[PDB]
Coordinates of C-alpha atoms in Angstrom, one line a residue:
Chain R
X4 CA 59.8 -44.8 36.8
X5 CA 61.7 -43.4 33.7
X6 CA 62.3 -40.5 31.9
X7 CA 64.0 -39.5 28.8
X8 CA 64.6 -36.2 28.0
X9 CA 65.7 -34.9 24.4
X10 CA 67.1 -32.1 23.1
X11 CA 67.2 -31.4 19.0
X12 CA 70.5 -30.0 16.8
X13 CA 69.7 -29.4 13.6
X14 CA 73.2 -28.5 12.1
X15 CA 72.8 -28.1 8.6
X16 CA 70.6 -25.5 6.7
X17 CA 70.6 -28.0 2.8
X18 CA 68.7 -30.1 5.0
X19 CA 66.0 -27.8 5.6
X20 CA 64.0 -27.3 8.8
X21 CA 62.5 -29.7 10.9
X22 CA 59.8 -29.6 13.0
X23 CA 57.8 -32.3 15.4
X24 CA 54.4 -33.3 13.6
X25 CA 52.8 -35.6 16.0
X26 CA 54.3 -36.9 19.6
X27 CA 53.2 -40.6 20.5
X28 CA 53.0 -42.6 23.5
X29 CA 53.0 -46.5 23.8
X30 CA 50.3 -48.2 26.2
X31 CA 52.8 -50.9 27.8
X32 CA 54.4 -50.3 31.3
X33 CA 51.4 -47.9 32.3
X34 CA 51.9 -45.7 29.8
X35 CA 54.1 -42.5 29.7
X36 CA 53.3 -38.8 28.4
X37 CA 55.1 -35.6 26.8
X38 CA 56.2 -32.7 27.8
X39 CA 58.5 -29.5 26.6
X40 CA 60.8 -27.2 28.6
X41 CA 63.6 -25.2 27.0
X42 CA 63.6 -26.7 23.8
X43 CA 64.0 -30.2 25.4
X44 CA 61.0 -32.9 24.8
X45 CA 60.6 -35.0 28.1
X46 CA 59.2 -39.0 27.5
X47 CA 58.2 -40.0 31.4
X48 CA 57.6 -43.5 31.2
X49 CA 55.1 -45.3 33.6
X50 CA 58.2 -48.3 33.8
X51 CA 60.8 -50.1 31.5
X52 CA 59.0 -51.5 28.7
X53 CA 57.3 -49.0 26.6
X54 CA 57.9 -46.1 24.3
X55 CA 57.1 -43.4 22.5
X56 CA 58.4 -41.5 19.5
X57 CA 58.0 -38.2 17.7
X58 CA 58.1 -37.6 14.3
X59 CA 59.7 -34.4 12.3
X60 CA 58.8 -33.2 9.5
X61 CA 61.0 -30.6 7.6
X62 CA 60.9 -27.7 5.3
X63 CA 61.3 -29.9 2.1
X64 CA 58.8 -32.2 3.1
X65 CA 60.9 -35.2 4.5
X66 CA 59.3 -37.6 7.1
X67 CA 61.4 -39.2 10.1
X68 CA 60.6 -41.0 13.3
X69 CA 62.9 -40.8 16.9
X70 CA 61.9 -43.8 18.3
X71 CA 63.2 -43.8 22.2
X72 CA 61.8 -46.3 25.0
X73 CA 63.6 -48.6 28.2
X74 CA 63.7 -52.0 27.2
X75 CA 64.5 -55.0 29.9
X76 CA 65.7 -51.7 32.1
X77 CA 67.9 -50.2 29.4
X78 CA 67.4 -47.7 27.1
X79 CA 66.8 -48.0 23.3
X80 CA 66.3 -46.0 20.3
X81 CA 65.8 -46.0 16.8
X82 CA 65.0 -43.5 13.4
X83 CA 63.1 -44.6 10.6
X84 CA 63.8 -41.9 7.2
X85 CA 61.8 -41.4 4.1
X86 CA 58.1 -42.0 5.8
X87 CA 55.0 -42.0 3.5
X88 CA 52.9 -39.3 4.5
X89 CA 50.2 -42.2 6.0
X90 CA 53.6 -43.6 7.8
X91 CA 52.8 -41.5 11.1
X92 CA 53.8 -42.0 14.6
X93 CA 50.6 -44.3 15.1
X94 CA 51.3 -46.2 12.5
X95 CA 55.4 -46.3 13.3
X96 CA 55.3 -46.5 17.4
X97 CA 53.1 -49.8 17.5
X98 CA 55.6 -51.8 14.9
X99 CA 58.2 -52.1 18.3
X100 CA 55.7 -54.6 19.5
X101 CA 54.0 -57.5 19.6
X102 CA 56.3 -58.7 16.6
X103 CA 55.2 -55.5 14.3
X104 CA 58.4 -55.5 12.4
X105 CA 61.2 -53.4 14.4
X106 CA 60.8 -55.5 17.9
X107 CA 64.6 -56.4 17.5
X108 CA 65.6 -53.0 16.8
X109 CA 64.5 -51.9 20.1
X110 CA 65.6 -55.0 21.9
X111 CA 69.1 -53.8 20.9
X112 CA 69.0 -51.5 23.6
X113 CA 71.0 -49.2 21.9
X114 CA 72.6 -46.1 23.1
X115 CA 72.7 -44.6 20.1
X116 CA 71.9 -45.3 16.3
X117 CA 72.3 -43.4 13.2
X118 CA 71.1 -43.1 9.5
X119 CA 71.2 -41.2 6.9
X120 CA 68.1 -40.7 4.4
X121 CA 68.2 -42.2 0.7
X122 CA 67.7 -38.1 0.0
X123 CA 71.2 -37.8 2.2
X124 CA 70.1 -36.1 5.4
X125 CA 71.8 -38.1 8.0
X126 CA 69.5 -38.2 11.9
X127 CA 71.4 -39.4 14.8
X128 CA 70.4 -40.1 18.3
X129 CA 72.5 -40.5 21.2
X130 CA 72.4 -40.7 24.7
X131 CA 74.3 -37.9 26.6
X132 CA 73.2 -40.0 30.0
X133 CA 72.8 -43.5 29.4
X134 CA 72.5 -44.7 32.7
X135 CA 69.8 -44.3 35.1
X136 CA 65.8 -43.1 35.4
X137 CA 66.4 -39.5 34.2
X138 CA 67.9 -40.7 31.0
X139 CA 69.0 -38.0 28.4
X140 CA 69.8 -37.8 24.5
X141 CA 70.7 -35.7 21.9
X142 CA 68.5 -35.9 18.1
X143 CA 70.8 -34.7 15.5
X144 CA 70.3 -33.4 12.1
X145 CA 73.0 -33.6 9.6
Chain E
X3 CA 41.9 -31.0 -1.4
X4 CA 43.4 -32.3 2.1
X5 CA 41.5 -30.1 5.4
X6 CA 42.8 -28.9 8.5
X7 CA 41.0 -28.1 11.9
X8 CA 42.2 -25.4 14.2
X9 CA 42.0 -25.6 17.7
X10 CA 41.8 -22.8 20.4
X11 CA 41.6 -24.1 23.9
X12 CA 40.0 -22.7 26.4
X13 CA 40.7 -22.7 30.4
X14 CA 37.2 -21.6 32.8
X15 CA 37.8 -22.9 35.6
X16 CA 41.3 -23.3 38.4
X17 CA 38.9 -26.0 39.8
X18 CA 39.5 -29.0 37.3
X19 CA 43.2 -27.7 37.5
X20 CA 45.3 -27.1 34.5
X21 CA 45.4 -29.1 31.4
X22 CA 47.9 -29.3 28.9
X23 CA 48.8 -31.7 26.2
X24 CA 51.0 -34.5 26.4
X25 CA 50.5 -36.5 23.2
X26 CA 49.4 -36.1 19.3
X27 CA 48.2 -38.6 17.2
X28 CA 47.1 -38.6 13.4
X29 CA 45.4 -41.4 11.8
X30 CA 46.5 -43.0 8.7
X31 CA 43.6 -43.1 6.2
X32 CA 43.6 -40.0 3.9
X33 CA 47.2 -40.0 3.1
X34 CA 47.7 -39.2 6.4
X35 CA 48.2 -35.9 8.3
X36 CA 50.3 -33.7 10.8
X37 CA 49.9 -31.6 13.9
X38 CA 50.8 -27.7 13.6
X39 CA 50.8 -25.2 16.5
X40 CA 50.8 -20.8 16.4
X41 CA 49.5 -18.3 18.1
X42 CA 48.5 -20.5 20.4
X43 CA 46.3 -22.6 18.3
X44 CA 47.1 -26.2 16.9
X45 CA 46.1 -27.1 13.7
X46 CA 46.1 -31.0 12.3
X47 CA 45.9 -30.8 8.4
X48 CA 44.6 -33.7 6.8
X49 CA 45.0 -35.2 3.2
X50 CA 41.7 -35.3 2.9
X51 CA 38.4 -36.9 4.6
X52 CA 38.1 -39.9 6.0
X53 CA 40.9 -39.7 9.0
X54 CA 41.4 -37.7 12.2
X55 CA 43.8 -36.7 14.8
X56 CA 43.8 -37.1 18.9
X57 CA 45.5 -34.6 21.6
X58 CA 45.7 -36.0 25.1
X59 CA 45.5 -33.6 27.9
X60 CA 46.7 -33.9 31.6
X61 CA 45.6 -31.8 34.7
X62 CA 47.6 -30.8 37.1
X63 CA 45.2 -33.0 39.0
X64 CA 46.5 -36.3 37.3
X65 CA 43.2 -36.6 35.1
X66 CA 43.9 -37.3 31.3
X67 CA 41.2 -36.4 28.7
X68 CA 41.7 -36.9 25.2
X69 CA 40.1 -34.9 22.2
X70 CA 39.0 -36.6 19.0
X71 CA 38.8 -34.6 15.5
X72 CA 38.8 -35.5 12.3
X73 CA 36.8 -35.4 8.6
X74 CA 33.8 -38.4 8.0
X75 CA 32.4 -38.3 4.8
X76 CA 33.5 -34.3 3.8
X77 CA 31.8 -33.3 6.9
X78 CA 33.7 -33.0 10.9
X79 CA 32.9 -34.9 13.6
X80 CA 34.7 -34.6 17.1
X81 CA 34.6 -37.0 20.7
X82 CA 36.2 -36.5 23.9
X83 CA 36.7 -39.4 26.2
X84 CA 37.0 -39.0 30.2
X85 CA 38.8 -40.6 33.1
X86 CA 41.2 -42.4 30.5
X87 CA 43.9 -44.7 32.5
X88 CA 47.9 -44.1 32.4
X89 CA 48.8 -46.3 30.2
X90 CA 45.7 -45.5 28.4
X91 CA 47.3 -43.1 26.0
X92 CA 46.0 -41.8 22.7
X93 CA 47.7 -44.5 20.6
X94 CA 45.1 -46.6 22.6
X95 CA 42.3 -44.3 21.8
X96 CA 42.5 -42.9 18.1
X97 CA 42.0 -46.7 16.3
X98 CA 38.9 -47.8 17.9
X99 CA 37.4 -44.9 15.8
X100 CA 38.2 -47.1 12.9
X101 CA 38.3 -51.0 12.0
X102 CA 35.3 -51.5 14.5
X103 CA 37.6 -50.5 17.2
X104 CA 34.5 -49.6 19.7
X105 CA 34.2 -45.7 18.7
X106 CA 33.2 -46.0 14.9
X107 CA 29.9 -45.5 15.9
X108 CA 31.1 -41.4 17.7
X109 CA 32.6 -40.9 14.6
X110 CA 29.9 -41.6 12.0
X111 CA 27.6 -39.3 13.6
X112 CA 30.3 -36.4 12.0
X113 CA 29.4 -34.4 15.7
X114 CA 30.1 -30.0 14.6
X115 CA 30.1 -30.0 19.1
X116 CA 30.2 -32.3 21.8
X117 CA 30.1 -32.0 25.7
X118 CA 30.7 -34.9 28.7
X119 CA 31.6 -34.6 32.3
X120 CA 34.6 -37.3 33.8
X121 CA 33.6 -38.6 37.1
X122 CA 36.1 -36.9 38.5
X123 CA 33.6 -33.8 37.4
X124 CA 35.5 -32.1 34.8
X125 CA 33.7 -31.0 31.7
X126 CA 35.0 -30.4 28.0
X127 CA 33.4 -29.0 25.4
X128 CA 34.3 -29.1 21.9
X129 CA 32.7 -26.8 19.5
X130 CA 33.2 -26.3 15.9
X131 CA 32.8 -22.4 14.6
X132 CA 34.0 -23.3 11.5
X133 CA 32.1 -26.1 10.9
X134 CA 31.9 -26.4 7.1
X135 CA 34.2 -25.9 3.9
X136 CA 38.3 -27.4 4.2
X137 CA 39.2 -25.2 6.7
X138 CA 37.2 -26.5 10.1
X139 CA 38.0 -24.7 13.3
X140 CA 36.8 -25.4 16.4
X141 CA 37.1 -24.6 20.3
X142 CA 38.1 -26.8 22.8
X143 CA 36.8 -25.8 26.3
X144 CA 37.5 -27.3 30.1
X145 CA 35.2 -25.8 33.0
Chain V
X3 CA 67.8 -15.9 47.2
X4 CA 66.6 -15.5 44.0
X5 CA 62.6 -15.7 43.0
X6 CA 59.9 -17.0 40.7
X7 CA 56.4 -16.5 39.4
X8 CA 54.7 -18.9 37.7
X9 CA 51.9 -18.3 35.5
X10 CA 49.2 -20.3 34.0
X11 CA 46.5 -18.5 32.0
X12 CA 43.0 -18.9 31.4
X13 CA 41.0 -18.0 28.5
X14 CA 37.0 -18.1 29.2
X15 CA 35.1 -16.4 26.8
X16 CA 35.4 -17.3 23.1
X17 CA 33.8 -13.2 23.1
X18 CA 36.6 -11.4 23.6
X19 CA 38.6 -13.1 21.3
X20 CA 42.0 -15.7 22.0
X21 CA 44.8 -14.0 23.5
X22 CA 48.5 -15.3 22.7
X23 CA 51.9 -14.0 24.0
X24 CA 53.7 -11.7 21.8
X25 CA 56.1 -10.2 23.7
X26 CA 57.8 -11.1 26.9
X27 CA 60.6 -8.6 28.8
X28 CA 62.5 -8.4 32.2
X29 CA 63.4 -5.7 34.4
X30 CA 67.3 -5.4 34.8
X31 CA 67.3 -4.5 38.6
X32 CA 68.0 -7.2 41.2
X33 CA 70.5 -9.0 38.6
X34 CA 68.0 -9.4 35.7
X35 CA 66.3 -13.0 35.5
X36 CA 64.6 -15.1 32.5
X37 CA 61.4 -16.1 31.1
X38 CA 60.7 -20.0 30.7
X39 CA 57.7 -22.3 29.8
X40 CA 57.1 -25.6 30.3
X41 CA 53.5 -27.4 30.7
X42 CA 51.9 -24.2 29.4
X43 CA 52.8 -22.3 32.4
X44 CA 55.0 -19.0 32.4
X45 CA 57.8 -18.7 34.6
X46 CA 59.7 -15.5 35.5
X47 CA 62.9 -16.6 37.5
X48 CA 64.5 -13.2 39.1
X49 CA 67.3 -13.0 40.9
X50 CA 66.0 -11.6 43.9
X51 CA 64.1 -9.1 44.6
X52 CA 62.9 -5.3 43.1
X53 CA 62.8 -6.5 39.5
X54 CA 59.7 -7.8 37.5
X55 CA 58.9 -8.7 34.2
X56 CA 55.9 -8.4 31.4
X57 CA 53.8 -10.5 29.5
X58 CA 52.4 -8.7 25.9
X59 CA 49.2 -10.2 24.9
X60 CA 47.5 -10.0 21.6
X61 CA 43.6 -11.3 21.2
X62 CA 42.8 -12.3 17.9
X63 CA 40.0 -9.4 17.9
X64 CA 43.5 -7.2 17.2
X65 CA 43.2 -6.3 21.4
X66 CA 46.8 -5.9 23.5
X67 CA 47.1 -5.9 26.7
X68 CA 50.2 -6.4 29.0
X69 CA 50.5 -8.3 32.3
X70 CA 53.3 -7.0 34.9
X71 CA 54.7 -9.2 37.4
X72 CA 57.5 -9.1 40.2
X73 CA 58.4 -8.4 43.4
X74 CA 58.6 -5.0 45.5
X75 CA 60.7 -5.6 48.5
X76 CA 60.0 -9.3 49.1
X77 CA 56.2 -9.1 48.6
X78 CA 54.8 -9.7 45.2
X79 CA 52.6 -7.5 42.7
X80 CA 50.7 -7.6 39.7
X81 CA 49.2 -4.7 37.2
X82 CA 47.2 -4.9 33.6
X83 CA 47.3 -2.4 31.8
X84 CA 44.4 -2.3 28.5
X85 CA 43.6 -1.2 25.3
X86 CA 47.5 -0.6 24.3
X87 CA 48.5 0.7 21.5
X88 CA 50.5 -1.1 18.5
X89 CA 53.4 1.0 19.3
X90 CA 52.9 0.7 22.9
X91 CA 54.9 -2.6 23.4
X92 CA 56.2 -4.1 26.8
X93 CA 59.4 -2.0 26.0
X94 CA 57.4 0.9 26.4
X95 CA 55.4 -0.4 29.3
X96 CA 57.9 -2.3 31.7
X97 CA 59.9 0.5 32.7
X98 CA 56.8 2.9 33.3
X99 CA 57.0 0.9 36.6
X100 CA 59.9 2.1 37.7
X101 CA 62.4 5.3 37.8
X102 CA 59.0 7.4 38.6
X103 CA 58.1 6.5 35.0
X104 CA 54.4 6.7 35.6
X105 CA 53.4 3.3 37.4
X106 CA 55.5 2.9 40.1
X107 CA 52.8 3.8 42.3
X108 CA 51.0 0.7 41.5
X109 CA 54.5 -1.4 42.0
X110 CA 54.7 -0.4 45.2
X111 CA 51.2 -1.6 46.1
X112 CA 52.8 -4.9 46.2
X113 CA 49.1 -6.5 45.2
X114 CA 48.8 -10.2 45.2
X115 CA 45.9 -9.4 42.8
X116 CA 44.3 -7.4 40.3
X117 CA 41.4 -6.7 37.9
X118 CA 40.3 -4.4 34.7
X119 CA 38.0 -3.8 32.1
X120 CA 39.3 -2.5 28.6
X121 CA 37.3 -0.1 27.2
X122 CA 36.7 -2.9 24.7
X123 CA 35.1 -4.7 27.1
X124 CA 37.4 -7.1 27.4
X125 CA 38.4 -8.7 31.9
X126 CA 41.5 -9.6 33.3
X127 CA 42.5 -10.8 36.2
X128 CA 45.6 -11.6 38.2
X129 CA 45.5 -13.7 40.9
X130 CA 48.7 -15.2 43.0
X131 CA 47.3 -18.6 44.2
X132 CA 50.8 -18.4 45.9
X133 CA 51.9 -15.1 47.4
X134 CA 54.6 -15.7 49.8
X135 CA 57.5 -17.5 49.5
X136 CA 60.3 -17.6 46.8
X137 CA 58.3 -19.3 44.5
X138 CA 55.0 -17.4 43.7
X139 CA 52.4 -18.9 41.9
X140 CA 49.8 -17.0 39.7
X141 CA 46.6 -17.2 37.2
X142 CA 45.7 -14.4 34.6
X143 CA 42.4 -14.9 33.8
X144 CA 40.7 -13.3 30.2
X145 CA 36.6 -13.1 30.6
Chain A
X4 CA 54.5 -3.4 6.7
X5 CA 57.8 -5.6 7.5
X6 CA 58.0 -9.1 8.4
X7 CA 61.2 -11.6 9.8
X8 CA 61.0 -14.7 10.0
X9 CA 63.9 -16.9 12.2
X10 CA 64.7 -20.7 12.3
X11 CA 67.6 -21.4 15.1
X12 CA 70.5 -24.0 13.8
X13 CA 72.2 -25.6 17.0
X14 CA 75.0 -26.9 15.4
X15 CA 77.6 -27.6 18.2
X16 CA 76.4 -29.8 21.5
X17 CA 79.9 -28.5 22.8
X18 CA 78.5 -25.0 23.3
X19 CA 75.3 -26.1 25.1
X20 CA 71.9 -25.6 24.1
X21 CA 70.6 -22.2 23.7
X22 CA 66.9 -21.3 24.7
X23 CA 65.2 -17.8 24.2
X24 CA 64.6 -16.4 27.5
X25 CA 63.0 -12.9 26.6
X26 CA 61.4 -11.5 23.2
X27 CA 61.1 -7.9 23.1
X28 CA 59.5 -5.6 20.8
X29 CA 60.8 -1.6 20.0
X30 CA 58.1 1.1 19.7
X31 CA 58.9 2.8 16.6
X32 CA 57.4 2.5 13.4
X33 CA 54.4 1.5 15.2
X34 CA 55.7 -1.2 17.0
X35 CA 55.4 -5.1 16.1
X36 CA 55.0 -8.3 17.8
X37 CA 56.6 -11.8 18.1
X38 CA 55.0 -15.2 16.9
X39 CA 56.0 -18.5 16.3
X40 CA 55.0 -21.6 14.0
X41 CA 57.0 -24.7 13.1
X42 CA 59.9 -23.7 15.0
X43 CA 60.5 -20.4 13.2
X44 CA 60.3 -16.9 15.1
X45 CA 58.6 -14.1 13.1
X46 CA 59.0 -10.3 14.2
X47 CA 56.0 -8.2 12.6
X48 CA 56.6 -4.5 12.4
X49 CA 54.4 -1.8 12.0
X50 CA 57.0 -0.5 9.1
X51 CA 60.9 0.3 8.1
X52 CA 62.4 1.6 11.6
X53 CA 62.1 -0.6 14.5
X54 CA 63.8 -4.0 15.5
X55 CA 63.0 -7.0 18.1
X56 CA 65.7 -8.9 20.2
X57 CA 65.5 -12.2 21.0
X58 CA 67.7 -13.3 24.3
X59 CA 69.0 -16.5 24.6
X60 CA 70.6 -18.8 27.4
X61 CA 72.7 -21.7 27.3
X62 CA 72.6 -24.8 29.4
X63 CA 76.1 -23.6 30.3
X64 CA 74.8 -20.3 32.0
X65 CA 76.0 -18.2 28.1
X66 CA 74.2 -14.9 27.4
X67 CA 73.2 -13.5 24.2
X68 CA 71.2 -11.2 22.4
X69 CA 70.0 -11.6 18.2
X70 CA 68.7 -8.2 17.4
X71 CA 67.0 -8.1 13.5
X72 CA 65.0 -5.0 12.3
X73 CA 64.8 -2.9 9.1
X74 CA 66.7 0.4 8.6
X75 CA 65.8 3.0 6.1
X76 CA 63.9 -0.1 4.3
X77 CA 66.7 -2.3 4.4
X78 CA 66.9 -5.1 6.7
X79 CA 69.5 -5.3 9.9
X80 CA 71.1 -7.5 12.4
X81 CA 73.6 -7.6 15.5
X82 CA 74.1 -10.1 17.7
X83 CA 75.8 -9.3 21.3
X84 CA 77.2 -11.7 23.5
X85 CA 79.0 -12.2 26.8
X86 CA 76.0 -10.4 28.9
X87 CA 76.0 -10.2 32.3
X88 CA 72.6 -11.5 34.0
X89 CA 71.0 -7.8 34.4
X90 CA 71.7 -7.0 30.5
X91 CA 68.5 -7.7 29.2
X92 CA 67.1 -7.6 25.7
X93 CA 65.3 -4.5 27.2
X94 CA 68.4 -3.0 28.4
X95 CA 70.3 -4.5 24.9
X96 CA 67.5 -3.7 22.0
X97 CA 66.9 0.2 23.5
X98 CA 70.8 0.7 22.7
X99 CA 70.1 0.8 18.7
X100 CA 67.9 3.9 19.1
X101 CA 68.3 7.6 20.2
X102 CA 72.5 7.3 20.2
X103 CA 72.4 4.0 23.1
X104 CA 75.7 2.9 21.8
X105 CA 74.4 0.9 19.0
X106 CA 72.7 3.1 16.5
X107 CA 76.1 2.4 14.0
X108 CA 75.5 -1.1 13.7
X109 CA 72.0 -0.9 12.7
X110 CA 72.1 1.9 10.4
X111 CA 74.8 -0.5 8.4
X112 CA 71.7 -2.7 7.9
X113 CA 73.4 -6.1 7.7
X114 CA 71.9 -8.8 6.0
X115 CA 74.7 -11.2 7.4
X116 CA 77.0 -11.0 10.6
X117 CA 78.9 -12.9 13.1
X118 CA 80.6 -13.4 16.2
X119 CA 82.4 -15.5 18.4
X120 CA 82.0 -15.2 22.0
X121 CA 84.6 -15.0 24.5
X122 CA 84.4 -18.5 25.4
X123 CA 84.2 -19.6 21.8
X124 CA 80.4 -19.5 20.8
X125 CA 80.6 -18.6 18.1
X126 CA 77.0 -17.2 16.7
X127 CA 75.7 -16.4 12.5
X128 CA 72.9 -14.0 11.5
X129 CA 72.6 -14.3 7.9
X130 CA 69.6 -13.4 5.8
X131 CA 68.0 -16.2 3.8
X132 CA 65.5 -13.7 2.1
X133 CA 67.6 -10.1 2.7
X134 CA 64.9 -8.4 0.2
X135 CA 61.2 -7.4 0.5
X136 CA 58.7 -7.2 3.3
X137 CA 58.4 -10.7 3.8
X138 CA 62.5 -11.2 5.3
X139 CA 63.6 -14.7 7.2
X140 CA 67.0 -14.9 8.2
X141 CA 68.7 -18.4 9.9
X142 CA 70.5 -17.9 13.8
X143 CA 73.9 -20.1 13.8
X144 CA 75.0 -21.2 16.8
X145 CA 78.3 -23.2 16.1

């Protein structure tokens, strides 16, 4: 029913390279996989209500989660910087729901969100098409 | 001294269609762990025993298999789990290897190879040619 | 009306070795084209016809071989050529296949399949599981 | 003998994304071959006198070409832009070699260089590691 489709900038060499570590995908609204094509990362969502996120890791070692989903029919998205290296995707992706933490966060609906590390690397994430089933967004690094 | 498993998958046969991976999970015991791919080959490095990693694979024929590796007690082990549902994804899967989840018992048997058939009659094998020492690699193979 | 071959590979025996991709060209008749991937499959998009492209493959038992697609005067083709030498890239190899450069023989053949043996030992095969059309579909097989 | 490593910075969602469409590899010094790992494109050469070319396309139908290589044991770069569909890297990346046009610009063995394409793309090679036989360089796209 849905389908997000992402596409990653990484605009600033101090903060190091990232790179995807793991690629997760929430069991609610009948599930959803991954997929790749031309450097853009795909979410296709069994239905509005479930998620899935992918989580970088970059050349000098820092740990981040892209949290992107369809909540209540609109899209949502979150980040969560400075990860332990046990914090994974598995551990991050479930905390959306069933009151794990960051349910409101994703009940926000938001179109975009931003943040910026406590080591100063700012991630943003923000949706080029909002609107729709073939939703699309832009993860930047900066 | 963390360990990492390298996977090469291999294709036999345009009858079960063609597989390819749509998810990546790694556990979080043992400091946790990430997924690598080169060459071709995708590697899930561990900080040490006592966790694993799962890569979900869909057909072109809408089947959705899901491989299991990972370190018990300094020694591999590996499961592979057929027919899965949609919204049965690997987040689904990889726990019930732990916390008496339903799959702790797979895991403890630390398998170096495993084989099943889905109903659908797909086969996987998983086979571990590196088997032993921090550096485990192993074959993952559809026919 | 431009035109594309996709290709999916499959890799069945662990004894020759794992192949990966490590080169990838296109001929510049017929207003050039592109290689893409998505879903592990290889896509050469041309724009039109009398142009192909080539897939270098490197086995991890230090083996190259190449894989030539395209299309000869709106009917597709395939060739393999083995045991290549390190120096003997897909630069080298592509435009053999044209300009009476030493292939174009097998070009013209317009095959919608094909089969070798390196001296190695090593099979390959090329088959178009869709042939006609503008959008051709293909397998290259390693055995 | 030689080794060069790339990471690709998209720093500009105005221009696009860029993709690499086509990797090729010259024949001398015993040729070479393209790999990647954690985002980063490596170009192995069988020694000091050949080059690779990596082709990329934007989302906005933009053409261009990265050639690296070494030179006389020093590392070089170009990067060509504004090519028309049929220009491919194995039209672009023969031009260095046997007086194609571009011989000049790889015997200056640049560790750094730049351009800005006629609609304003403006894309960076600069070398990160310009010494040894283990090189990696950073692609700019801006």
């Amino acid at each position: 029913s849905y389908s997000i489709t992402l596409r990653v900038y990484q605009t600033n060499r101090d903060r190091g390279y990232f790179s995807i570590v793991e690629k997760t995908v929430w069991h609610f609204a009948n599930g959803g996989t991954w997929s790749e094509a031309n450097g853009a990362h795909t979410l296709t969502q069994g239905g509005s209500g479930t998620s899935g996120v992918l989580r970088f890791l970059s050349t000098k070692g820092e740990r981040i989660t892209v949290a992107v989903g369809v909540h209540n029919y609109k899209r949502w998205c979150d980040v969560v910087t400075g990860l332990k290296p046990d914090e994974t995707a598995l551990v991050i992706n479930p905390q959306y729901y069933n009151n794990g933490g960051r349910d409101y966060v994703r009940e926000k609906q938001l179109a975009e969100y931003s943040v910026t590390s406590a080591i100063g690397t700012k991630v943003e994430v923000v949706y080029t098409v909002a609107e729709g089933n073939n939703l699309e967004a832009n993860v930047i690094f900066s």
